Subunit: 388 residues, 4 copies
Amino acid sequence: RNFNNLTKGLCTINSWHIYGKDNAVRIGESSDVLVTREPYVSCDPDECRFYALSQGTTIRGKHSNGTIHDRSQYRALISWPLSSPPTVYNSRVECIGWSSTSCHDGKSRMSICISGPNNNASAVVWYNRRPVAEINTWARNILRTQESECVCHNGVCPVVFTDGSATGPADTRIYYFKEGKILKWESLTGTAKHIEECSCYGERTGITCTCRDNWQGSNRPVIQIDPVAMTHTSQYICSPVLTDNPRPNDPNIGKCNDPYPGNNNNGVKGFSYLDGANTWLGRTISTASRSGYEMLKVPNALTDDRSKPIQGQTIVLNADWSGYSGSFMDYWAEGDCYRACFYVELIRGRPKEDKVWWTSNSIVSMCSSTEFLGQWNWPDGAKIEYFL
Amino acid sequence: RNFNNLTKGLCTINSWHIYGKDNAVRIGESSDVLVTREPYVSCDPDECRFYALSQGTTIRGKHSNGTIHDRSQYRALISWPLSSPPTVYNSRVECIGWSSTSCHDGKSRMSICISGPNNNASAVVWYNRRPVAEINTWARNILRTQESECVCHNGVCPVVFTDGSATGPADTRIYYFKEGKILKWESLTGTAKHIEECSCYGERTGITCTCRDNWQGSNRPVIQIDPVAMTHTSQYICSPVLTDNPRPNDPNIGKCNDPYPGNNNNGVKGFSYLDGANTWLGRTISTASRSGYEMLKVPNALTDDRSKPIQGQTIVLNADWSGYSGSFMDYWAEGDCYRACFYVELIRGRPKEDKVWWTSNSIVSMCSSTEFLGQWNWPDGAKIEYFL
Amino acid sequence: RNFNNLTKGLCTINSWHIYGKDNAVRIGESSDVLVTREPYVSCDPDECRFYALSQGTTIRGKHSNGTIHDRSQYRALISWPLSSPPTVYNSRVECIGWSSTSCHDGKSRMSICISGPNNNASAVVWYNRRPVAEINTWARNILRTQESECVCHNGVCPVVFTDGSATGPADTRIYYFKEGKILKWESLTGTAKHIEECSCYGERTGITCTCRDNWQGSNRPVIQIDPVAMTHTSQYICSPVLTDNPRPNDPNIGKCNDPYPGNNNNGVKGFSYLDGANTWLGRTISTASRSGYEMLKVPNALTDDRSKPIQGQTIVLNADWSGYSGSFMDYWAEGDCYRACFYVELIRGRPKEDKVWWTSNSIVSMCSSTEFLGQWNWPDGAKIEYFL
Amino acid sequence: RNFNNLTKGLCTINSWHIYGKDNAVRIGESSDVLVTREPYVSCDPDECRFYALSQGTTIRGKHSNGTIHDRSQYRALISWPLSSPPTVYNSRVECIGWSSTSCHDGKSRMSICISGPNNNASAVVWYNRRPVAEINTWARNILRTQESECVCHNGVCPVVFTDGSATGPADTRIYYFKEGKILKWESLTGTAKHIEECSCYGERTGITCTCRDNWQGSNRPVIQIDPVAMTHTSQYICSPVLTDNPRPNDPNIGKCNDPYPGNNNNGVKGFSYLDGANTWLGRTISTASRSGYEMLKVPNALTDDRSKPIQGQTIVLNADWSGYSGSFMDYWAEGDCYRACFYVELIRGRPKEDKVWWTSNSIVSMCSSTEFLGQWNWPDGAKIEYFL
Ligand SMILES: *[C@@H]1O[C@H](CO)[C@@H](O[C@@H]2O[C@H](CO)[C@@H](O[C@@H]3O[C@H](CO[C@H]4O[C@H](CO[C@H]5O[C@H](CO)[C@@H](O)[C@H](O)[C@@H]5O)[C@@H](O)[C@H](O[C@H]5O[C@H](CO)[C@@H](O)[C@H](O)[C@@H]5O)[C@@H]4O)[C@@H](O)[C@H](O[C@H]4O[C@H](CO)[C@@H](O)[C@H](O)[C@@H]4O[C@H]4O[C@H](CO)[C@@H](O)[C@H](O)[C@@H]4O[C@H]4O[C@H](CO)[C@@H](O)[C@H](O)[C@@H]4O)[C@@H]3O)[C@H](O)[C@H]2NC(C)=O)[C@H](O)[C@H]1NC(C)=O
Ligand SMILES: *[C@@H]1O[C@H](CO)[C@@H](O[C@@H]2O[C@H](CO)[C@@H](O[C@@H]3O[C@H](CO[C@H]4O[C@H](CO[C@H]5O[C@H](CO)[C@@H](O)[C@H](O)[C@@H]5O)[C@@H](O)[C@H](O[C@H]5O[C@H](CO)[C@@H](O)[C@H](O)[C@@H]5O)[C@@H]4O)[C@@H](O)[C@H](O[C@H]4O[C@H](CO)[C@@H](O)[C@H](O)[C@@H]4O[C@H]4O[C@H](CO)[C@@H](O)[C@H](O)[C@@H]4O[C@H]4O[C@H](CO)[C@@H](O)[C@H](O)[C@@H]4O)[C@@H]3O)[C@H](O)[C@H]2NC(C)=O)[C@H](O)[C@H]1NC(C)=O
Ligand SMILES: *[C@@H]1O[C@H](CO)[C@@H](O[C@@H]2O[C@H](CO)[C@@H](O[C@@H]3O[C@H](CO[C@H]4O[C@H](CO[C@H]5O[C@H](CO)[C@@H](O)[C@H](O)[C@@H]5O)[C@@H](O)[C@H](O[C@H]5O[C@H](CO)[C@@H](O)[C@H](O)[C@@H]5O)[C@@H]4O)[C@@H](O)[C@H](O[C@H]4O[C@H](CO)[C@@H](O)[C@H](O)[C@@H]4O[C@H]4O[C@H](CO)[C@@H](O)[C@H](O)[C@@H]4O[C@H]4O[C@H](CO)[C@@H](O)[C@H](O)[C@@H]4O)[C@@H]3O)[C@H](O)[C@H]2NC(C)=O)[C@H](O)[C@H]1NC(C)=O
Ligand SMILES: *[C@@H]1O[C@H](CO)[C@@H](O[C@@H]2O[C@H](CO)[C@@H](O[C@@H]3O[C@H](CO[C@H]4O[C@H](CO[C@H]5O[C@H](CO)[C@@H](O)[C@H](O)[C@@H]5O)[C@@H](O)[C@H](O[C@H]5O[C@H](CO)[C@@H](O)[C@H](O)[C@@H]5O)[C@@H]4O)[C@@H](O)[C@H](O[C@H]4O[C@H](CO)[C@@H](O)[C@H](O)[C@@H]4O[C@H]4O[C@H](CO)[C@@H](O)[C@H](O)[C@@H]4O[C@H]4O[C@H](CO)[C@@H](O)[C@H](O)[C@@H]4O)[C@@H]3O)[C@H](O)[C@H]2NC(C)=O)[C@H](O)[C@H]1NC(C)=O
Ligand SMILES: CCC(CC)[C@H](NC(C)=O)[C@@H]1[C@H](O)[C@@H](C(=O)O)C[C@H]1NC(=N)N
Ligand SMILES: CCC(CC)[C@H](NC(C)=O)[C@@H]1[C@H](O)[C@@H](C(=O)O)C[C@H]1NC(=N)N
Ligand SMILES: CCC(CC)[C@H](NC(C)=O)[C@@H]1[C@H](O)[C@@H](C(=O)O)C[C@H]1NC(=N)N
Ligand SMILES: [Ca+2]
Ligand SMILES: [Ca+2]
Ligand SMILES: [Ca+2]
Ligand SMILES: [Ca+2]
């Protein structure tokens, strides 16, 4: 009934506990489960749900052949109950397209989907399940957005978009929406040199987004947004604990205002929680491919170019495939602090497992604990040979 | 809680954006998706849904054999969540029959289904999910109706029916319903010479229906209805931009008060938005068969027999199958204008793809934008060979 | 919020219109549809639903083998949305057992299921989805009940039970429930000599039940119940238009107070609407087996032993299988009269179609019209050979 | 809106009536039914539901191979509508883990799931569908809990946990939760020597839990909890009617304060209702394996070491497989007493039926009657050979 305001700080993060897991590939071996990728999680005031980009076919369906493809007319943003798999019969379509974001402002949910050919893409902004505003491509090269949830404050929901080359200078914009309408947009400023797929969270200080430099960087760009003034700045995570993938080995001095070099023209969506001594970074374990996942406690990672881990937790073993990761929080939970959460996309199939002709994923998700909890590891769990 | 009144004009239409798409044939290759045809879209005050005539079998089911047939005892009007496919487990049956219309009046939804043999058909009018009134055939020859949504004003919901020959003079009536009860009916008046499958929308000026002349015309008949006086007139779209299918090539002078000749005893359900300089017409790209779909901006198409396009947008490539098309709007959306919307039925199977024994469809739907958005094309997307 | 009172008379019945049809066997050929039998329909104040006794297996499931059996531990009363099929995923279990009745009193629904071996069966009475009262067998021989909906007045819902031989004298009781609790029960009185499977409806005059004499009669016993005094009487339909199955040919004088002879130890559940000149009887067309179905207007059938039809309507052709039939009405519909409704069970499989090893059914349902509507015929529609 | 208080005594138990049964294995032979084990039942103020630990695969799915395993990353506590089977499309995930409990306090539901490796397991406590508190392992040996519902009084919901050896002395704790937060915990006191899988119910006197001694006992330990003082005591059921499995034959003197010897390092979850002369015990019929199930009326079983049965009821024949059993009640039912209920897990597959590679179950559930009802028997009902 009222817009949510970001009035709390992050809860102290001493470990991570299991929040959700859908086992979608395991179940989809023998159930009508939609092929997906680019999943995330987002909360309403009364419910938290899984989100992803469907490929408009089930995994066992013959149309799963070719689903490594990123952008087709058969994709849509869908949502479904927490820890259920995305099935044909329980998935709610939020909008049509092949790149998305979504968030609830306390009153209603805004969802954004982009569709179109590479040179003529357009975003449609939905609010309370109705289309409200539209944004045409500005650089005519795959207009695209976060692939995880946005964050709102007093009705204002900033969203990061990029249009242009994925392997060079591009045109990144921050849009400020309210009830789906465009209040304002800004071109990217600050020292981040390339921006993709921002993972955002909000707290009393403002909104923090950790992104993917797909051009020259293996450190992650950060965009900090003031949703009241509707302004932002950008830089990189200063820490030498590098968190993109693929990536070089960790040095002892990171880079605050420029890409850390070694790997070009690639990356993976990821996230971090940047909160002084309460700072935690997520990354794939492997420096070469999207396998494994760990959280590392790196004090002042955002600002300290010497910072190293003082604690950690394995989420997925290096022997198991991971993928995209991003942040979300239940802004409507009771208590005096916001509990940090994240999900990890567990990609199965192509390109790495090419005995099948499809690409899909399942989801695992965690939230922070003030306890120091024992760790497990959370594989997708499907046997690829069952699909042969 | 109150009846909706048509108090707004159309939003300015500068392009079209994707609204919904269910990918039903793709998904139905390996899911329990009902065989359908004659789909449409209609909104409640709190939700918009897909509608269609089920054939009472799934596509993979052996009973899909023979579903080219138009009128069986196994058909029903079903509705299901926007952009989901019509599955056995998520489809709500509105009423039983093989021709239908449906609309919400602001308080409750009226649904009409016609069933029966060709010489003894009858309509049942449902209101708030209960049968309220019934109408017996008057010409004993396939009593039939719109196959898209009706429109209401202050509780009054006009509906166009036809009974009689589909290839000659027939008996068309306009009925005026309120809470499912018959207030009044009228025989067709005006210059339209044959009427089928009217696609309607409402705005402050009244209700506008674009129909199908299945007898001698390839221009589309139009019926204009005053839901307050409960009266109507009819003519044809004057424009030489002809919009039926099949159809002759576009001349330079159209016909306002008589069928444009060249093609007899056939047609396709279609629609238009007739709003002065803000006028847009939909049509198949092919003049020979139901393939492709485009929208054309044709100023004053209704009244100007010389009018030509000044802008357009491709919806479906000519290389891809289309089918029926019709209008709907979310009359309960916020703002100062009604946003024009439409759907296109994408028919797959027989008669054109006869290596399968079934006929079904999927749906694509668009709404207008005040932006000038880039265009894509929206194929059904199923590979027919997967069903062999 | 208040108990419903029976304050209206029946609407004038001039013909019948299609109300619902689920096509369950057609769809179940390739969908997870539960095997059922003994279906019915019953309304809540906000919704009308299909009901039936599941067999605890789908039709395609290997456990469908043997489902001709009447009483197993795997049966349950289920309900599901009007005109949907009874699927594993959309069916709500009301209670466990192999004989049932159910009705809404205006505030909440009472459901009764009987389970047990032949000599030790017991009824459990559920109210507002909780078990409230239980009734043990009194004759130790298949305690059993209506297999269609009961009817309530000011909270009082009478139900007819039988315990004892199905082919001789048995012990029939009328129970009077309120909020699931037993107010009173009575032994059968009047001239009906054997009672099974009563089909009931209520109006201002009281509650009328048409039953099945499975012993010596081919005319139908009738029980008339005053839900205020909680008393009843019984007789037979006097009309020589005989309505059981199997049955002798129609004579010219029927029997008011004794079974009409010719066929012993068999019958079928059926119904009638007994309302003076507005009287309609349902029956199978065949006198030999459960095939075909027709409604006949037989003025004063209840009291006139000479009464013959003056109008009729075919529901199912004799060439198509029928089965059980029963009455229900939407007591919560608006207007000044109760609209008579009925369903027909369309049995497929064993014993008549024994190339399959299962027995199931679909449902067709009609309601009365004050119009004189054209008639169609409504087959189950499944091709049995598809299941081989 | 208010916390439930335990203000009533147990209803007099004179027999048991069928409450629910899902036939999950029968249906899962040809439907997307999840593999489960460790099921239970629990009520909300407006609904009662089935619960179980999913294995993250369907029965027909190839991933059902190996589901005898107790603790994997693919398990989750799910709930689903009463007497429906646990399907992919109707099951709601409550939390992730391989051991669980859940209960409603009158306002909202608390659910607890434990996950992790054997030496590093942790419990997450959810309240109103959000994670609220976490508890780390204290003995580093399979932290584990009830596998049936907990019970609340004025917001306080006690839960019994065990950590440590399953075949020797272990560390059992009673936790006291309110709105998911830990008010207090206590180490086990009293004469019970080993505690597993407590089955609890509440009434005005307090909360009673019947557990499983997996070490040296074949009599069942009992924990009695005062949810106001938040204190407890423990002992064994004194009766010589022994109720664990496997177990020795019944002696004539039981043991109140020590394990009854004969069988070591095994057991089965079970329950009892301990209420003076109104006392009923459940047990498997076989003393050797988990087959059959019966209820026995054993007056003062808790305190009388000579007590023997004076009445009984067979639930499952010895010829049929049973498994875990536990207590629940609808604390929100109307009336002056709490109606005792229980469920029995009917395990199918491995280890006893090893021609299949999976292990799953279905559920049967009963509630008490004040009538003396006839008894039936309730097998799972699936034919194992259909799965070959
Ligand atoms: C039950 O569950 C519990 C809870 O989960 C389990 O306990 C957990 O165990 C895990 C696994 O060991 C721990 O995670 C690691 O944490 C360490 C950080 O803690 C260590 O270091 C701290 C900092 O020390 C520095 O400062 C202090 C200041 O005093 C100074 O004294 C010290 O000398 C040093 O200068 C210490 O404070 C800390 O000690 C404390 O905690 C101890 C317990 O851990 C305890 O015993 C002590 O008493 C004290 O209380 C401790 O020593 C992380 O460093 C580590 O992450 C690195 O290693 C993993 C591989 O295991 C790797 O994947 C990570 O990426 C990372 O290493 C890479 O990056 C580094 C940084 O750039 C680089 O330096 C490395 O060379 C390495 O780089 C290579 O790999 C990466 C990745 O592939 C690649 O990108 C690079 O290019 C390169 O190739 C782990 O996260 C948990 O913290 C711990 N949790 C708790 C609460 O205890 C418990 O084990 C379970 N029980 C059982 C029986 O299983
Ligand atoms: C990214 O996306 C954007 C947005 O979608 C893309 O931009 C769009 O591009 C499409 C495709 O070109 C455009 O659609 C066409 O629009 C034209 C109408 O616009 C043209 O004509 C206007 C009218 O000109 C007249 O009046 C002016 C008054 O000043 C006068 O000056 C002029 O000389 C003439 O007298 C012009 O105003 C307009 O110019 C403006 O816009 C230009 C951009 O388009 C711009 O460059 C200019 O500067 C200016 O601003 C422009 O010239 C439609 O005519 C056309 O539809 C016809 O053609 C298609 C085939 O492509 C056909 O399917 C249609 O049915 C139709 O042609 C049939 O019907 C005609 C009418 O009867 C008939 O005459 C034809 O012979 C033909 O008939 C045959 O086929 C039919 C169908 O099968 C059959 O039934 C007949 O029997 C017969 O066989 C298109 O709709 C969009 O308007 C445009 N949108 C925007 C906002 O720009 C962009 O391309 C994308 N980018 C990339 C890189 O892909
Ligand atoms: C479009 O749809 C419309 C609407 O549905 C269709 O119109 C409908 O058509 C059907 C089919 O014909 C009609 O159903 C039949 O109705 C008759 C009753 O109506 C007839 O009889 C009335 C009574 O006459 C008596 O009294 C009058 C008083 O004046 C007196 O004048 C007369 O001489 C006689 O004494 C007449 O009033 C009535 O006339 C009126 O209506 C006419 C239209 O029908 C109209 O033309 C007239 O102008 C006038 O207005 C009319 O003559 C039922 O008798 C009949 O049911 C019997 O026959 C069917 C087989 O068709 C059978 O299945 C039934 O069970 C029943 O016959 C069995 O039972 C009898 C009673 O015991 C027995 O006597 C029979 O021998 C027979 O018994 C055998 O079979 C049974 C069953 O298997 C077995 O159990 C026995 O043992 C034995 O073996 C039909 O129900 C509709 O009424 C009619 N509706 C309307 C509104 O018009 C229209 O056709 C469709 N259009 C097209 C093109 O298809
Ligand atoms: C329709 O449905 C109805 C309702 O369900 C059916 O009626 C039911 O029928 C069942 C089956 O018979 C009954 O269950 C049994 O109940 C008896 C208890 O009742 C008997 O004993 C009572 C106590 O007598 C003692 O005190 C009295 C005090 O006066 C004294 O007089 C007497 O001499 C003695 O000292 C009697 O009061 C009672 O009589 C009353 O009820 C009679 C009807 O039952 C009636 O005829 C009388 O007039 C009177 O009114 C009656 O005699 C339980 O003992 C029994 O449970 C034992 O047996 C079963 C096997 O059947 C077994 O599975 C149980 O575990 C148990 O036996 C084991 O444990 C014992 C205790 O340790 C042990 O002693 C045994 O040796 C045995 O141990 C072995 O097996 C176990 C298990 O595998 C193993 O662990 C051990 O190690 C060892 O190997 C049954 O539960 C119902 O009570 C009854 N219900 C009602 C309301 O009547 C009706 O039959 C159905 N109709 C039809 C046609 O089918
Ligand atoms: C070309 C730009 C890419 C991001 C830097 C690309 N984004 C889009 C909209 O295509 C992603 C990338 O190619 C894939 C990934 O690296 O796994 C997913 C893919 N993302 C989506 N398909 N939504
Ligand atoms: C004979 C009259 C026809 C319309 C002019 C016909 N309508 C009905 C009720 O049968 C349509 C037409 O035959 C088919 C179409 O052209 O695709 C669909 C078909 N419409 C439906 N099956 N609902
Ligand atoms: C033996 C008594 C019979 C009724 C007269 C019998 N009723 C029960 C409870 O078994 C019915 C009868 O045998 C079958 C019918 O005639 O189709 C159904 C069957 N009814 C049900 N299975 N519910
Ligand atoms: Ca990079
Ligand atoms: Ca035409
Ligand atoms: Ca009979
Ligand atoms: Ca034991």
